[PDB]
Amino acid sequence: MSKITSSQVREHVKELLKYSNETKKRNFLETVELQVGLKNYDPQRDKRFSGSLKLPNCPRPNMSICIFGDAFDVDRAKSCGVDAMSVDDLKKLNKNKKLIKKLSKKYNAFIASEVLIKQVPRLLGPQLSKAGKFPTPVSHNDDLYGKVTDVRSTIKFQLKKVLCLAVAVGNVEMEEDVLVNQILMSVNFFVSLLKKNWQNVGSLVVKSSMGPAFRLY
Amino acid sequence: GNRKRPVPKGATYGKPTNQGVNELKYQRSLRATAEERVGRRAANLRVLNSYWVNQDSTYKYFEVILVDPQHKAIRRDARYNWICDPVHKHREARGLTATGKKSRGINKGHKFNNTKAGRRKTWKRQNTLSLWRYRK
Amino acid sequence: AISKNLPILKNHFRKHWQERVKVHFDQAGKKVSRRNARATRAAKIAPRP
Amino acid sequence: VNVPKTRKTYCKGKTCRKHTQHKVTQYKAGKASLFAQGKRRYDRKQSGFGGQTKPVFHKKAKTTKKVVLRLECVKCKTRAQLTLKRCKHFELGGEKKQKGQALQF
Amino acid sequence: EEHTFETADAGSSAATYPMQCSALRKNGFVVIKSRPCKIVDMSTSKTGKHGHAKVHLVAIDIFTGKKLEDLSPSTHNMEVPVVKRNEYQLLDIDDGFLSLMNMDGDTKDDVKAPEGELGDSLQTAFDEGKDLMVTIISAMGEEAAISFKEAARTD
Amino acid sequence: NPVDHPHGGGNHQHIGKASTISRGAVSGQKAGLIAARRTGLLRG
RNA sequence: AGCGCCGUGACGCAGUGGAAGCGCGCAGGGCUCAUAACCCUGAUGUCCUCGGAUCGAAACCGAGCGGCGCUACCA
RNA sequence: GAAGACAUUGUCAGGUGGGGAGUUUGGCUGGGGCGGCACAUCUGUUAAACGAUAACGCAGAUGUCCUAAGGGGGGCUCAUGGAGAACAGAAAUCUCCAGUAGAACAAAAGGGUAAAAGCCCCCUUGAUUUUGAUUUUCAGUGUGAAUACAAACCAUGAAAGUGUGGCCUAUCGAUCCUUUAGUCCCUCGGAAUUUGAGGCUAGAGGUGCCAGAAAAGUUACCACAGGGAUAACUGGCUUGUGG
RNA sequence: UUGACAUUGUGAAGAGACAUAGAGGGUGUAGAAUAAGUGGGAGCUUCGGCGCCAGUGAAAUACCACUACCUUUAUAGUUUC
RNA sequence: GUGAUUUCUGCCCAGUGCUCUGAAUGUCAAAGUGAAGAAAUUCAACCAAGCGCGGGUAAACGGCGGGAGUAACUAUGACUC
RNA sequence: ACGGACCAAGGAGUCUAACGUCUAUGCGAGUGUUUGGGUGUAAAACCCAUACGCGUAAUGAAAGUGAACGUAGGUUGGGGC
Numbered sequence A: 001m002s003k004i005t006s007s008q009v010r011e012h013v014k015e016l017l018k019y020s021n022e023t024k025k026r027n028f029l030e031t032v033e034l035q036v037g038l039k040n041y042d043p044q045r046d047k048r049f050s051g052s053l054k055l056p057n058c059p060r061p062n063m064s065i066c067i068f069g070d071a072f073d074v075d076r077a078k079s080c081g082v083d084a085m086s087v088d089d090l091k092k093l094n095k096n097k098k099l100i101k102k103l104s105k106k107y108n109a110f111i112a113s114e115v116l117i118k119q120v121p122r123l124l125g126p127q128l129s130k131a132g133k134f135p136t137p138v139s140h141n142d143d144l145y146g147k148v149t150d151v152r153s154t155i156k157f158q159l160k161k162v163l164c165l166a167v168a169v170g171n172v173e174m175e176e177d178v179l180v181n182q183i184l185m186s187v188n189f190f191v192s193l194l195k196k197n198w199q200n201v202g203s204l205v206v207k208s209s210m211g212p213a214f215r216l217y
Numbered sequence B: 001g002n003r004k005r006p007v008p009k010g011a012t013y014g015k016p017t018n019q020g021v022n023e024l025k026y027q028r029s030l031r032a033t034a035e036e037r038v039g040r041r042a043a044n045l046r047v048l049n050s051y052w053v054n055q056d057s058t059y060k061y062f063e064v065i066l067v068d069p070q071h072k073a074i075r076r077d078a079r080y081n082w083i084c085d086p087v088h089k090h091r092e093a094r095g096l097t098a099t100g101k102k103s104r105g106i107n108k109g110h111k112f113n114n115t116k117a118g119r120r121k122t123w124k125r126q127n128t129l130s131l132w133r134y135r136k
Numbered sequence C: 001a002i003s004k005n006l007p008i009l010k011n012h013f014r015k016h017w018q019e020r021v022k023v024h025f026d027q028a029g030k031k032v033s034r035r036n037a038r039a040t041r042a043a044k045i046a047p048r049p
Numbered sequence D: 001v002n003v004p005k006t007r008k009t010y011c012k013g014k015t016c017r018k019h020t021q022h023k024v025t026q027y028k029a030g031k032a033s034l035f036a037q038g039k040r041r042y043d044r045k046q047s048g049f050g051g052q053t054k055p056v057f058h059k060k061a062k063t064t065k066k067v068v069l070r071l072e073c074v075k076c077k078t079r080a081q082l083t084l085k086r087c088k089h090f091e092l093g094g095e096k097k098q099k100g101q102a103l104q105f
Numbered sequence E: 001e002e003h004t005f006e007t008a009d010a011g012s013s014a015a016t017y018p019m020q021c022s023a024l025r026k027n028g029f030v031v032i033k034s035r036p037c038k039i040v041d042m043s044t045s046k047t048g049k050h051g052h053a054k055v056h057l058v059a060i061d062i063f064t065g066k067k068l069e070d071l072s073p074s075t076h077n078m079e080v081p082v083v084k085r086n087e088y089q090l091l092d093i094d095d096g097f098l099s100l101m102n103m104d105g106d107t108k109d110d111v112k113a114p115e116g117e118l119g120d121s122l123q124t125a126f127d128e129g130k131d132l133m134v135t136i137i138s139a140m141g142e143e144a145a146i147s148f149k150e151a152a153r154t155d
Numbered sequence F: 001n002p003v004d005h006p007h008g009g010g011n012h013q014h015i016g017k018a019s020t021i022s023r024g025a026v027s028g029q030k031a032g033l034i035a036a037r038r039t040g041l042l043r044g
Numbered sequence G: 001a002g003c004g005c006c007g008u009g010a011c012g013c014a015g016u017g018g019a020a021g022c023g024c025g026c027a028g029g030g031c032u033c034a035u036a037a038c039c040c041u042g043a044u045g046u047c048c049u050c051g052g053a054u055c056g057a058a059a060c061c062g063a064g065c066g067g068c069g070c071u072a073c074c075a
Numbered sequence H: 001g002a003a004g005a006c007a008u009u010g011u012c013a014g015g016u017g018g019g020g021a022g023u024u025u026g027g028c029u030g031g032g033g034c035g036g037c038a039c040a041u042c043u044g045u046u047a048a049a050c051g052a053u054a055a056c057g058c059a060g061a062u063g064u065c066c067u068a069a070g071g072g073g074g075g076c077u078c079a080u081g082g083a084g085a086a087c088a089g090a091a092a093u094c095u096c097c098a099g100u101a102g103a104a105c106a107a108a109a110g111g112g113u114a115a116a117a118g119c120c121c122c123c124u125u126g127a128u129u130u131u132g133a134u135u136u137u138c139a140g141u142g143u144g145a146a147u148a149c150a151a152a153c154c155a156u157g158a159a160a161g162u163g164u165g166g167c168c169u170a171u172c173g174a175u176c177c178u179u180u181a182g183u184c185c186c187u188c189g190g191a192a193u194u195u196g197a198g199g200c201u202a203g204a205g206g207u208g209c210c211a212g213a214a215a216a217g218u219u220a221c222c223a224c225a226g227g228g229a230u231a232a233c234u235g236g237c238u239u240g241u242g243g
Numbered sequence I: 001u002u003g004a005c006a007u008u009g010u011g012a013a014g015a016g017a018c019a020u021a022g023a024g025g026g027u028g029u030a031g032a033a034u035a036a037g038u039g040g041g042a043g044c045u046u047c048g049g050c051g052c053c054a055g056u057g058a059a060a061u062a063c064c065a066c067u068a069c070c071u072u073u074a075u076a077g078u079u080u081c
Numbered sequence J: 001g002u003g004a005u006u007u008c009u010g011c012c013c014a015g016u017g018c019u020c021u022g023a024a025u026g027u028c029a030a031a032g033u034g035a036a037g038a039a040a041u042u043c044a045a046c047c048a049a050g051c052g053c054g055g056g057u058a059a060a061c062g063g064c065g066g067g068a069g070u071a072a073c074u075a076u077g078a079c080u081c
Numbered sequence K: 001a002c003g004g005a006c007c008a009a010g011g012a013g014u015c016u017a018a019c020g021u022c023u024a025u026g027c028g029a030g031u032g033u034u035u036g037g038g039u040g041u042a043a044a045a046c047c048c049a050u051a052c053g054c055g056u057a058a059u060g061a062a063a064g065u066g067a068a069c070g071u072a073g074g075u076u077g078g079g080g081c
């Protein structure tokens, strides 16, 4: 047994889906999320946990990611359908922080080739680190469609400064069996990153993009 | 309270198990100590019984019933002249009152196997090597 | 010490046991005494059995 | 050392009795769980006067431990324990080796 | 079928190894009162006229910088931590808490920025840029930044 | 000699440990300066 | 006799198996009538030798050299 | 007169406590001490051509490392030299010839291996289950390691076949206690149910003084039992050193 | 030495914690209003009013955010300094 | 502790000790409190002193460094690193 | 190397509980009277009931179950007849 049993989640998720699928018909997509709270836990004193796992299927394929990389990766990413940006156009963009301020905003994530290490910090500024989006490595043998599927599906848990975190673990328009599975994999992944496991969580809110933010515990 | 061990400066001279001074308990009750002191005070009488009457944090208070073995009202009156027998001299000093039989453990059953016919007598019997003429 | 193929013995003689040895030399005397007590009691309570 | 999280091996679960798929985890000891008879005896022996009553080990020599693998059949949930040799670093299902790759220095 | 994925840790092994007392050296590491320390002074003396040796040891804690002293017979064993240093590349430093990157792009946003004379100089050398390489010492479940170097080549 | 006093013994005459003694020390230990807030000559 | 440690730029010293760094010193220009201070810029190393293991050693191993040390007690 | 439900006193609980108590303070060792490890082990030699064989003999090594560096199959041949090919040079890649291994096989050393045991590639988990027998150390005990079958379930291959970890020789651990797995079994003894506890079979947590106590000194204030099994003076053998 | 219980009875006036709910932005520069944060993301309403874009910053603004402390507030009570 | 008089009694509070604060926090026993349980019990919060953190103190215990260059004969080095 | 000037007298593997191998004796699937009773020429000798010990059943942690397929098996030796 845990603090959460899949039965209680099964009954919250049903009317959570029944609201979005039946009642309110908005002209755009609806996304289900997970929000977590932390209690008796102090970011300044304690250890800032950091974890991510490969979620089985992507919660939202409608997010824009830019392919930093060398000639080989840009060549196989320009044919993929993902915006592949070179290394020699960034060469003197460091002149102005505004030139890269828009770069971080438009792309929901960044992944770069293994030559990112020497370059991406110093070629750019520290904005990407500040923004919470730092490029993740991709190898020459790693199929780039594999990473852009993986990096799009993975959820990252990070204790940055505040006791509240939130990862997105689905879109509404899936069948309900995989929704209860993934909402249940993400909660006990989150507790596994804590000192006392379930004894540090004090808030678990699951919901959909626009409506009834159900509390769980 | 407890019976502090009356060794000078707490220095017991022996093994660590016997190094205790403070958390040691007297094997007789305070009611038996009360009976001892009253019987010594009134050595011409025989302690019959005692009971609790009161207590505060420092003292427990008891009342002792004593019988006069010389009074002719007690020497006659068959229901009580057993106490005039010499065998009942200082029965409270030998643990023969109710509190003394309780502290000696004198009761029936398996819970009192150590102390039924007196524990030192039980120990002597259990620790006696009995040899017969035609050895068994 | 432990030596040879011999059974493990459990002779409980590590106390002052020689102070509590009872030898029943008085077996014959106490049997005579018991018969004497029975005879005197029979005489006292006669003819009760 | 690096061991996969998944492994096909023999399951003696009275319904498999054959090689089935297993999930691999590392064995963790578990809480000492007082009210165990040895813990009750120890508490009774340590109560009172007499000091420390049992040996207290001091002469540590080992620096590693044997790793025990907890194998769970995916068909009947029967579990089995396997023992590996001593190691300093142990990991499960991570970063299969790359053969012909340049050194990253 | 099953759930929760049985997420675990997959750990083992000791943070200290027992080696000796007389085999220690200055600039080596030793555990004193459960703290990791760097030896700066060790001396040996005979205890009597036909007795044996004892080692007096003076060492600085590798994290708090405090002096610790201890003494032991030269032939008993003491613990030595498994002190390790790691290269990282210096990304942003925002609320202290230097965010670092390994030889791969994997990030360590876990280590407090040093608040001492080395840490403030690190921040000043970081504000104008000139990407740094910071060394992290990580003995006995504690981590700390101890040095920083300007990259040599590839300007 | 050491049998007589905490300061006794030695191949030279010296106290050997701090002569400042805590208030919570026990009888036989309070030889020297007991619960001293400071020692040494006043005003340097 | 046995044992331990050290050797890095002219000097004093750091140093994470991926070709070496601090402070002065030195060099070039400037300011001054000139030197110093000051300002702007550069340069300086078989890491004591000679072999070995490693893809690659300043670090590890073997020797050789030069210094510093420690033990030296009961008789 | 002061003080007052506070102090005090009782019991339990945490701290402090060489003031005091009890105990300990390994072994081997050309006396002991300091040093070292010859204390559990492995390679070569000493070792005197079966086996065994000592020393604080000699030269070294071990407390690890590995999902492959384990298992099978396939294809190929290594170090090195010569001759050649823009930059390219003594050292970058390419080609041919010669090449018995002069390479490689995690790590000491020794042994072993060429259509392989090396290198590259394709699959995979036999590094599995149940026990018994055997070899070495040996008391023919344990522990560690290993060998050959049996009964299953598998991997690989066209197949013969091979595979019960690492090409072989080292790479490690009882009782008590704790913990997990298995049978879902046995017991809690007045009779049941459910917790809890205890059992049976098999792993782990560790004893490196490695057949496995829980352990700091000093003594010229010293004590006892002994020892010429053992040092310091004389004698004896030797004579490097001295002459 | 420190805490608790007992000894141990009789009383009042300022604080302060538990649970329900309503409130709340507190700032430096500056978008377009005075910005306490992080995740999602272009819609219901009589207002096209607001967000999207483009300017603005350390960080976007409609909306879902009864989520995250933090700062206040009125309770039938229950607890302590 | 030192040891008549005279004349002096330098520098060092990092360590060990002694001593003094705070409540901004870490550790934190028994009793008491809350929650889960059928209950034994388990978990959590609160949590005194001490410790920890931070000051003071050497007529407290005590301690009180290396190397190199440099003067118009050399040598030394007032000076300098 | 130590003990021994001389002589007399004394002066050191005992008894007990439990037990192993061997041997003797009795009876033998049984065996053991002597706790006790009876009796007596009285600590002897003689007589004795019921029990109890060991043995005739093992194995298992335990709940439990529990010894002939057969001339109580086959093969190889085997004294004696």
Ligand SMILES: C[C@@H]1C[C@@H]([C@H](O)CC2CC(=O)NC(=O)C2)C(=O)[C@@H](C)C1
Residues within 6 Å of the ligand: D054, D055, D057, H175, H176, H177, H205, H206
């Ligand atoms: C060191 C720890 C304990 C140790 C062991 O139980 C220690 C002793 C304790 C004792 O009093 N008697 C014994 O027979 C063993 C053990 O088994 C290790 C694996 C784990």
Ligand SMILES: [K+]
Residues within 6 Å of the ligand: none
């Ligand atoms: K002693």
Ligand SMILES: [Mg+2]
Residues within 6 Å of the ligand: D047
């Ligand atoms: Mg008790």
Ligand SMILES: [Mg+2]
Residues within 6 Å of the ligand: D047, D048, D049
């Ligand atoms: Mg106690």
Ligand SMILES: [Mg+2]
Residues within 6 Å of the ligand: F006, F017
């Ligand atoms: Mg003292």
Ligand SMILES: [Mg+2]
Residues within 6 Å of the ligand: F002, F005, F006
């Ligand atoms: Mg003393």
Ligand SMILES: [Mg+2]
Residues within 6 Å of the ligand: F010, F011, F012, F013
């Ligand atoms: Mg003297």
Ligand SMILES: [Mg+2]
Residues within 6 Å of the ligand: none
């Ligand atoms: Mg003592």
Ligand SMILES: [Mg+2]
Residues within 6 Å of the ligand: none
């Ligand atoms: Mg010895």
Ligand SMILES: [Mg+2]
Residues within 6 Å of the ligand: none
């Ligand atoms: Mg041994």
Ligand SMILES: [Mg+2]
Residues within 6 Å of the ligand: none
């Ligand atoms: Mg031979």
Ligand SMILES: [Mg+2]
Residues within 6 Å of the ligand: none
């Ligand atoms: Mg057990």
Ligand SMILES: [Mg+2]
Residues within 6 Å of the ligand: none
């Ligand atoms: Mg001799």
Ligand SMILES: [Mg+2]
Residues within 6 Å of the ligand: none
């Ligand atoms: Mg000569």
Ligand SMILES: [Mg+2]
Residues within 6 Å of the ligand: none
């Ligand atoms: Mg005086």
Ligand SMILES: [Mg+2]
Residues within 6 Å of the ligand: none
């Ligand atoms: Mg002075």
